[PDB]
């Protein structure tokens, strides 16, 4: 400051700071930026959900926030077109084919640990606009003098007192010396509480007993305490080895360090794996108000999905009464395999509204002075209530975080009062009455700033939308834990201060069901996140293998590769308020997002901008890894018997079923001993069994007792209860990994035809056909090997069967200059373009034909459940050969309309085998002789009739022999 005394400019800089700070203070009260104009009223959320690269991709703007029947399908189509030269049917012509492969994406609550750390801070980076005016920008001078002209004392006489005890209470918990906790000014803590609660009661789809049994409630209908709302959990279920995918990666990794909430959420999920369960009733109970070392869990799983759980109590009236019933949230399993979690309005909260009105707040309680929330007493209550326990709240996801944030603010039982509603209200909270008045009014009114809001909006959007693709043959991705912070609920300006009644553009009530905000929050996580899965699919290890170092294991081999991971560079971080510190293992998502859609990077879409600026870091080690919960470990079609990694990939089987993307690529049970790095290809997997303390006769686990023992598939389990088996497989070249599809549809190139040579990964002309051959043999259905001379580590023979796509052409492990493709089973059978796989194998070898791909892929929203028919139209092997050049022949060539002869096309690329006796061999002694002609017999009997109208009868008949008796000679 002394120096700036002495700079020619120095005195101006000083006059100016002082002068601006002095005028800005005088009238804090008329300060807001929400109401400036129609977009930046209602927080600049008009247009976020669909960027323009993405509109092109075709996702509709209904927004992907689960509604009763919503599925998102990413399906790419390609249309390969082979120009066949020495056909086996008459000598030229080309043969277009067309197919489509469909991904599945899920969106829902993301389970990986939430690292939210909540600390009151005192700063004006977010806070509120009234607060912003209130403290001068740079010159530190007491302001209460000025502030008082503008705020009655009862608020500020009282608030400060709230700020004193609240400080003491936190000093209670961390035993911090209390100099070092600070009174809050930050409002990301609030923006988050009211925002989280809204993007839960509006996003979710609610089951009202409108009558008789459960029903849906229309976009416009009351939510009674008794509304099951189920939130789609970014999970998938099935049959075959992976019962659920994808689990949190880390639940699986050998030492967990999990919290209380996950331990009763992961066990809940695992019981959900048995091939016959439907909705695991997790009830939590019995939690005392000193502390929580005593809460009984119980699991009752009823084996149908819709008998989801129920409680006898309307909204609890004071938390201690709310406590007794205890908090129970069921989990149920889907249609379309989206594991849906269901919960009840009574649960999220307990009834704050203890309205006390318009007099100086009493010695100890919080009061919210709400101006002109008329009859929204119920919508308000839901927004601002200590969660049912009001203490340690055991909801599985964000709610648990929201409850924790609420709990930082007040001890169990600080009774909150509402003023400006008459003495009571009902809880009905019909929705807009929720978002019209309730979340929008609530934040605009308190002058709470865009910046607090984009942060809450993106953070929620981040822990309600982690979208991970559905590959069930292998896992998905292990959606990584995100590190974020937020200050508690009390807020200087929001909590005890007056409600600021003036609007600027769009008016609080005229905001409908907040589709803009709600879709906007939901979309942002999915689009940004999708690249990360998509990015993972797109890029992998160059040589197809992942190094393993000695005793290893997959979690551990996971962090060693990280040392060699590569990511794009962030750029222009103006928006994040110096919360910009790294670990070099945390790259914000929007590191990836730039990679895929490169186009987002110049700052023209909030979706990229909003995301990178204030978007939780995540963590990036475990992201390669996949975890899924499998039925048993050690009898899996593909345990590649450890040794192949030892000697080398003598064989690899990729076998792609009739319809889906998926490849059940092979893995090497991956704690396998040795003295040096041996390069694995292509997947390293690890099976683990965890056993958890047993239930009392009914359903007891005490939360603390819950202790998990890692053991492996070679350690004995008769002792230790088990619940599920964890398998995590890490992989390099994403072939037949559901993502590959995710990578293609979204990053991948589209709508320009490019020949096999350009697509293929091989180098010389010669070994570019061999790959193009290897796949085209694999479409029809007859396995095809590409065999390599043993040197290098590539795995001696790679064979694939089944319906492969061309971009998949791209990912097949090299092939150069040693190796020719050999067909494993040559049995010739009817097929679709060909028959007798070998003639094909010769066909490729001659440069007879080339196949040029073009494909266009669209991301889609499917809202109504649809049925599809896959027809493989397929020619015979008996009579594929025969049909001998119909067109050189000069009789056919002459009964066919001319172009036909002219155009290039053909039904088949290569002819088959094995025709049965070859002519109409009927032993003579079967040809009767036509009897001699009768000359004079009139022909009205045989000459064809001519058109007359009507229809008349057929007389035929039979008798039905008793069916039962023949059913007796059996079928069929």
């Amino acid at each position: 400051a002394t120096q700036m005394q002495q700079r020619d400019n120095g005195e101006e800089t000083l006059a100016n700071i002082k002068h601006s700070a002095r005028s800005e203070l005088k009238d804090m009260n008329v300060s807001g930026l929400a109401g400036i104009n129609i977009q930046a009223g209602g927080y600049d959320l008009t247009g976020l959900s669909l960027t323009d690269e993405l509109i092109a991709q075709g996702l509709s703007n209904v927004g992907l926030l689960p509604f009763e029947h919503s599925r998102v399908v990413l399906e790419l189509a390609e249309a390969i077109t082979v120009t066949a030269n020495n056909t086996d049917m008459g000598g030229s012509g080309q043969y277009c084919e067309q197919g489509a492969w469909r991904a599945w994406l899920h969106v829902g609550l993301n389970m990986a640990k939430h690292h939210v750390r909540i600390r009151s801070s005192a700063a004006m980076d977010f806070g509120t606009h009234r607060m912003m005016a209130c403290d001068p920008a740079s010159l530190d001078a007491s302001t209460i003098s000025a502030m008082s002209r503008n705020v009655t004392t009862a608020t500020m006489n009282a608030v400060s007192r709230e700020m004193k005890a609240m400080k003491a209470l936190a000093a209670g918990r961390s035993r911090m010396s209390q100099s070092d906790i600070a009174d809050n000014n930050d409002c990301r803590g609030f923006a988050f509480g009211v925002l989280s609660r809204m993007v839960m009661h509006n996003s979710a789809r609610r089951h009202g007993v409108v009558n008789g049994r459960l029903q849906e409630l229309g976009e416009n209908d009351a939510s009674t305490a008794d509304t099951y709302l189920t939130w789609e959990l970014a999970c998938a279920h099935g049959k075959g080895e992976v019962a659920i995918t994808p689990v949190p990666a880390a639940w699986l990794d050998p030492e967990a360090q999990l919290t209380g909430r996950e331990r009763v959420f992961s066990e809940a999920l695992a019981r959900l794996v048995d091939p016959d369960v439907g909705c695991v009733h997790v009830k939590i109970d019995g939690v005392t108000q000193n502390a929580a070392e005593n809460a009984r869990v119980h699991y009752a799983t009823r084996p149908d999905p819709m008998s989801w759980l129920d409680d006898n109590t309307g909204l609890s009236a004071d938390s201690n009464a709310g406590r007794i019933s205890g908090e129970h949230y069921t989990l149920w399993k889907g249609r379309h395999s989206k594991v849906h979690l269901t919960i009840q309005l009574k649960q999220l909260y307990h009834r704050m509204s203890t309205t006390a009105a318009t007099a100086e707040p009493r010695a100890d309680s919080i009061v919210y002075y709400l101006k002109g929330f008329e009859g929204l007493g119920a919508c308000a209550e839901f927004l601002l209530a200590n969660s049912r326990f009001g203490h340690h709240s055991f909801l599985p996801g964000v709610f648990g975080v929201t409850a924790d944030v609420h709990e930082a603010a007040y001890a169990q039982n600080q009774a909150l009062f509402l003023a400006g509603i008459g003495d009571r209200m009902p809880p009905a909270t019909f929705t807009k009455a929720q978002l019209a008045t309730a979340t929008y009014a609530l934040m605009r009114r308190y002058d709470i700033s865009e910046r607090t809001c984009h942060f809450a909006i993106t953070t929620i959007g981040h822990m309600v939308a982690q979208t991970a693709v559905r590959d069930l043959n292998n896992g998905s991705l292990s959606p990584l834990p995100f590190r974020v912070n937020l200050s508690p609920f009390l807020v200087q300006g929001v909590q005890f201060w007056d409600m600021n009644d003036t609007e600027g553009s769009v008016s609080v009530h005229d905001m409908g069901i907040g589709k803009e905000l709600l879709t906007a929050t939901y979309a942002l996580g999915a689009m940004a996140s999708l690249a990360h899965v998509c990015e993972q699919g797109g890029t992998g290890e160059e040589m197809s293998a992942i190094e393993v170092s000695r005793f290893t294991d997959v979690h551990t081999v996971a962090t060693d590769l990280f040392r060699k991971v590569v990511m794009t560079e962030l750029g222009d971080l103006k928006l994040r308020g110096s919360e910009v510190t790294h670990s070099s293992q945390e790259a914000l998502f929007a590191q990836k997002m730039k990679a895929v859609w490169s186009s987002m990077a110049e700052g023209s879409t909030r979706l990229y901008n909003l995301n990178q600026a204030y978007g939780p870091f995540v963590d990036v080690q475990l992201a390669r890894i996949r975890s899924s919960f499998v039925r048993d470990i050690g009898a899996s079609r593909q345990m590649m018997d450890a040794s192949a990694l030892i000697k080398h990939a003598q064989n690899v089987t990729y076998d792609w079923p009739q319809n889906e993307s998926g490849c059940p690529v092979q893995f090497i049970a991956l704690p396998v001993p040795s003295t040096i790095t041996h390069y694995a290809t292509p997947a390293i997997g690890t099976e683990r069994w965890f056993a958890t303390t047993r239930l009392n006769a009914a359903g007891s686990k005490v939360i603390s007792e819950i202790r998990w023992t890692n053991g492996l598939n070679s350690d004995d389990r008769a002792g230790v209860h088990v619940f599920a088996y964890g398998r995590s497989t890490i992989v390099s070249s994403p072939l037949g990994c559901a993502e590959a599809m995710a990578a293609m549809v979204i990053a991948g190139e589209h709508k320009v035809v490019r020949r096999h040579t350009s697509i293929a990964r091989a180098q010389s002309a010669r070994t570019a056909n061999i790959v193009a051959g290897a796949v085209l043999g694999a479409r029809n259905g007859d396995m095809m090997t590409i065999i390599r001379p043993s040197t290098s580590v590539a795995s001696s023979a790679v064979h694939l069967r089944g319906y492969i796509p061309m971009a998949a052409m791209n990912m097949l492990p090299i092939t150069d200059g040693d190796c020719d493709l050999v067909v494993a089973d040559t049995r010739t059978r009817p097929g679709r373009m060909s028959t007798s796989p070998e003639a094909h194998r010769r066909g490729v070898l001659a440069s007879d034909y080339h196949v040029d791909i073009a494909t266009d892929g669209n991301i889609r929203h499917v809202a109504r459940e649809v049925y599809t028919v896959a027809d493989i139209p397929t020619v015979s092997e008996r009579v594929s050969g025969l049909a001998l050049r119909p067109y050189e022949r000069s009789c056919v060539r002459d009964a066919s309309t001319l172009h036909s002869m002219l155009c290039g096309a053909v039904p088949l690329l290569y002819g088959g085998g094995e025709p049965m006796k070859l002519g109409d061999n009927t032993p003579v002694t079967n040809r009767q002789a036509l009897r001699p002609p009768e000359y004079n017999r009139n022909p009205a009997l045989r000459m064809p009739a001519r058109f007359q109208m009507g229809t008349t009868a057929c007389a035929f008949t039979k008798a039905l022999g008793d069916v039962r008796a023949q059913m007796e000679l059996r079928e069929g």
Partner: protein, 1005 residues
């Protein structure tokens, strides 16, 4: 989208203390609302003689273009939605040789809607001319004119649904404004300003919300074409058009339904598995439906329309009610007659069980366009009994087109290709086969309220305000002709594609397995349609709207067969094309004395007239040249013969059979439950050819717990409260059960019943199972019944997988059926109304099928026309090739005119006239020598009486449309072509202010 709307970003600043004007009144967007009318109303009066200029059956109408500023305003708001760029417009351009044929068939074509199949023929009197020469002096024998009519029956395809339209909302100022109405209600005002009259308030806003489902906006272009399909379907039903009936009565009265294959006093032939199940149904009097043959021996079933499509709805289902995710379309206001028609189209949903045409009636409902007449947009419902007859039924189409497609005139024509693609040529000759085709359906993804748009824009009256006029009918009957003209182009093209596969692709029989024979023919088509689009990347543009796979459309087949520019048939963006379904399921005849077919030696050398006379005097179905029990007979080795494959073992027909005894547990429970229905349901009508996989997949789905299969079992009395699970029904394997096996009465005597009840698809429907679940399960049941009928009769229960079923396997390869040959004969005659057109030249001594100097046609049509002519005279012309085969043209071993395919060079040797009215046409005298036979044709279109027609057009009604409306202004003033339209407000900025209240925070003093 990339940018927030321009209207939303703009600010009041710069401001000043003196900026009095209210917010609403600046930041108001620039709109100049009235938009000039753009098109011309009337056909034009001739200037001289004052006689109205005529274009047939035609109504042309005027439509609002919108002012430049106003579309810009609509745009700032719709930042983030995708509306298809315009579909291209192209006439169909054909090759030169085919150009002349397509023009002629097109010129007049008049269907004659007899018993469930479209009818056309050109009556033709032709003078056979025999040309031969003596040393350079010509000779001619033309004794008499044959009078014969070529009839081309067009029977509808078998439809099934898979592919659902992608969500792009077809582009209209009805669609653009719907998109705003959805975005404004949902995402609160301030994603748009109040966008309609009546959307201002709230309690207007709430009533619009509760109805209109969330993803719910404009796809008329797709919902229109499926409506067109079903009314055209309903036009075959209640054909007379003097029919007057109640809707229940219409459902109950039994018209013939158009089943697969021809049937003759002593044989049936070439009928699909569905047809063979229904043949037993007719034969054994167990079902209520009787199989009957229309003239020429064609095939038909006599069920009630209710019975085919509509069975399995419990009494919850009627009238496409609100918030069921269905389409819910707006009815214009008209006499109950028309309102009752729209109600009856999508009566309690009727799923696709195919009678040949039952399909068409079904199609509207499955895609979910389900008109509503209740509820505030569309007029008061019309009483149970309002008798819509074919006149009010046509009105509905007429209006459907005027208000769908916004008078765009690409989409409306584009519909015709899809409607034309649904119709085959029929099968008449007694072993047709050669029919491996089914139109696969799309169901629209996007559901939006029909009356929501109309109620929200009605300023005065509370009802949907589109008004029917007597001009919609002129459009209806005009469109009926446009369909009637385009169908001849489609049906011709399809035949050519079939010929292309038949001649050239390799088709062969092993063990006389017909389906496997047919399946190959389907594959070739499937590859002769994919090449038509003509690039890899243009297909993706043509796809954009549809998200079934790229299954190529059925008329793409016609585009290949036909001259082949693929833009005209389904455009680069063509909402709702139907792709190809594998409907090839069999041939399968049967006889009066169940028997196989005798094979007749004919020995080739020494053509004698008397052996050929005897053959003509033989019967039409049963003679078959080669017996293929053991051998694979390709048409290169065996041209032109029927290969009669003998009765069908258990073994062929495995991928079809639905009773088997291999089931593991708690699928044993499900399958026993299915069998018990099958054995009991008197009166079931079959057409769904359920395979072994359909029941496999159904029982797998039914066993595993999903909420749907779970609720089903709790409904139907299995598995919740079941104590007799284990033993009661898991060891009950049929061939236990007592008493009657086809009657619902279960004694209290009976021992061994599965469960002591029978559920019909009303209770199962009244315990709430999707109409899809109950239908498919109920469909399986009916199929198992269917199949029970065949097993009983069959040589055995297929205990052995070579056990002989009662019917046949006989395929006529190297032969075109009567339907295909009549199709060529009809088209061939239209080009030869005047000219001679010598047909067969040098009948002996070169190929029959030849192309030379002047043709005007390929050369199938030349010999095809010749066949149909020799049919109606009395001729049996045998074409015998050196090698080993011999087949006739005119009359045949099949019966009636059937030209033989030339994979082997055919040469004529002798003609045999059945009966002698000694005034023959010189042909026998030209085969001794070798000469050319010129055929001077005179044809007369098969024009029926008014009370059986596809389209009646009103030639006089051009008096109405001609004049061009206009409002000539007297007393000067200025009225340009400008009418008012909608307008919208836009966002604007409103600055709000709460009524001041004092609590005890605020400063006051």
């Amino acid at each position: 989208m990339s940018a927030p709307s321009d209207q939303s970003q703009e600010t009041r600043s710069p401001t000043s203390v003196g900026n009095t004007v209210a917010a609403d009144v600046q930041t108001s967007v620039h709109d100049k609302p009235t938009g000039e009318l753009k098109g011309s109303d009337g056909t034009g009066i001739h200037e001289a003689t004052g006689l109205p200029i005529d274009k047939r059956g035609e109504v042309p109408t005027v439509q609002l273009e919108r002012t430049a500023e106003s579309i810009a305003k609509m745009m700032d708001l719709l930042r983030s939605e995708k509306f298809t760029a315009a579909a291209a417009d192209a006439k169909l351009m054909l090759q030169q040789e085919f150009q002349n044929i397509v023009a002629c068939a097109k010129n007049a074509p008049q269907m004659t809607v007899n018993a469930g199949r479209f009818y056309l023929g050109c009556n033709s009197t032709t003078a056979i001319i025999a040309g031969d020469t003596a040393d350079g002096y010509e000779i001619e024998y033309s004794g008499k004119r044959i009078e014969g009519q070529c009839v081309v029956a067009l029977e509808p395809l078998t439809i099934t649904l898979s592919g659902s339209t992608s969500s792009t909302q077809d582009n209209s100022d009805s669609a653009k404004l719907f998109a705003l109405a959805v975005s404004q209600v949902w995402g609160g005002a301030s994603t748009v300003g109040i966008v309609a009259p009546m959307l201002q308030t709230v309690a207007q806003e709430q009533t619009f919300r509760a109805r209109v489902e969330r993803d719910s906006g404009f796809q008329h272009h797709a919902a229109l074409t499926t409506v067109v399909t079903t009314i055209v379907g309903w036009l075959m039903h209640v054909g007379d058009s003097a029919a007057k009936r109640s809707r229940d009565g219409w459902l109950d009265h039994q018209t013939d339904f158009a089943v697969k294959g021809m049937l003759t006093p002593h044989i049936a032939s070439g009928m699909d598995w569905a047809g063979v199940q229904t043949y037993s149904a007719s034969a054994m009097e167990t079902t209520t439906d009787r199989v009957r043959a229309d003239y020429a021996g064609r095939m038909v079933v006599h069920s009630t329309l209710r019975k085919q499509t509509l069975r399995s709805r419990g009494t919850g289902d009627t009238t496409e009610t609100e918030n069921s995710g269905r389409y819910l379309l707006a009815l214009p206001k008209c006499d109950a007659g028309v309102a009752a028609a729209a109600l009856a189209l999508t009566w309690g949903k009727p799923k696709l069980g195919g009678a040949g045409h039952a399909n068409l009636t079904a199609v509207m409902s499955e895609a979910g366009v389900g008109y509503i007449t209740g509820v505030n947009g569309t007029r008061a419902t019309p009483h149970a009994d309002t008798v819509f007859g074919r006149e009010e039924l046509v009105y509905l189409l007429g209006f459907a087109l005027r208000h769908m497609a916004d008078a765009q005139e690409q989409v409306i024509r584009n519909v015709l290709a899809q409607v034309a693609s649904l119709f085959r040529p029929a099968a008449c000759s007694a072993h047709e086969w050669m029919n491996v085709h089914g139109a696969l359906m799309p169901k629209v993804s996007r559901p939006m309220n029909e009356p929501a748009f109309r109620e929200v824009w009605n300023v005065a009256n509370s009802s949907s305000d589109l008004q029917m006029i007597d001009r919609d009918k002129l459009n209806g009957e005009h469109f009926l002709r446009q369909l009637a003209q385009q169908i001849t182009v489609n049906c011709t093209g399809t035949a050519m594609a079939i010929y292309q596969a038949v001649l050239a692709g390799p088709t062969g029989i092993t063990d006389g397995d017909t389906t496997r024979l047919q399946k190959d023919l389907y594959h070739h088509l499937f590859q002769y349609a994919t090449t038509t689009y003509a690039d890899g990347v243009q297909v993706m543009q043509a796809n954009t709207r549809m998200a079934n796979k790229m299954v190529p459309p059925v008329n793409a087949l016609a585009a290949w067969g036909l001259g082949s520019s693929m833009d005209s048939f389904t455009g680069p963006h063509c909402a709702y094309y139907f792709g190809l379904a594998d409907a090839a399921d069999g041939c399968f005849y049967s006889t009066t004395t169940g028997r196989t077919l005798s094979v007749y030696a004919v020995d080739v050398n020494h053509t004698s007239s008397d052996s050929y006379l005897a053959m003509a005097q033989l019967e039409p179905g049963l003679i078959a040249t080669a017996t293929g029990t053991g051998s694979t007979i390709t048409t290169n080795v065996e041209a032109a013969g029927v290969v009669d494959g003998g009765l069908v073992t258990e073994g062929h027909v495995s991928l079809y059979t639905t009773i088997s005894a291999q089931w593991n547990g708690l699928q044993r429970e499900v399958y026993n439950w299915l069998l018990w229905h099958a054995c009991k349901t008197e009166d079931s009508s079959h057409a769904d050819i359920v395979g072994a996989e359909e029941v496999k997949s159904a029982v797998e789905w039914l066993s595993s717990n999903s909420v749907e299969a779970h609720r089903f079992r709790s409904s139907a009395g299995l598995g919740a409260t079941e104590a007799a699970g284990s033993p009661g029904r898991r060891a009950w394997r049929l061939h236990h059960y007592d008493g009657q096996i086809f009657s619902n009465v279960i004694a209290d005597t009976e021992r061994h019943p599965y469960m002591r009840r029978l559920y019909t698809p009303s209770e199962l429907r009244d315990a709430r199972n999707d109409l899809f679940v109950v239908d498919r399960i109920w469909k399986i049941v009916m199929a198992m019944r269917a199949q029970l009928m065949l097993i009983s009769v069959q040589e055995d229960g297929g205990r052995h997988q070579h056990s002989k079923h009662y019917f046949g396997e006989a395929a006529a390869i190297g032969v075109m059926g009567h339907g295909f040959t009549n199709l060529f004969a009809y088209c061939a005659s239209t080009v030869h109304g005047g000219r001679e057109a010598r047909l067969i030249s040098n009948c002996t001594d070169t190929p029959m099928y030849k192309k030379e100097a002047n043709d005007l046609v390929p050369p199938m049509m030349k010999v095809a026309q010749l066949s149909t002519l020799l049919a109606h005279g009395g001729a049996w012309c045998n074409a015998v090739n050196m090698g080993g085969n011999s087949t006739s043209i005119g009359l045949s071993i099949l019966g009636d005119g059937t030209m033989p395919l030339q994979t082997v060079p055919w040469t004529v040797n002798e003609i045999t006239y059945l009966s002698e009215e000694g005034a023959r046409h010189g042909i026998e005298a030209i085969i001794d020598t070798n000469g050319s036979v010129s055929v001077k044709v005179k044809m007369t279109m098969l024009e029926p009486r008014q009370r059986f027609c596809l389209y009646d057009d009103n030639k006089t009604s051009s008096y109405i449309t001609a004049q061009e409306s206009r409002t000539a202004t007297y007393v000067t003033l200025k009225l340009g072509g400008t009418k008012n339209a909608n307008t919208i407000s836009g966002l604007v900025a409103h600055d709000y202010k709460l009524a001041t209240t004092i609590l005890a925070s605020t400063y006051d003093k």
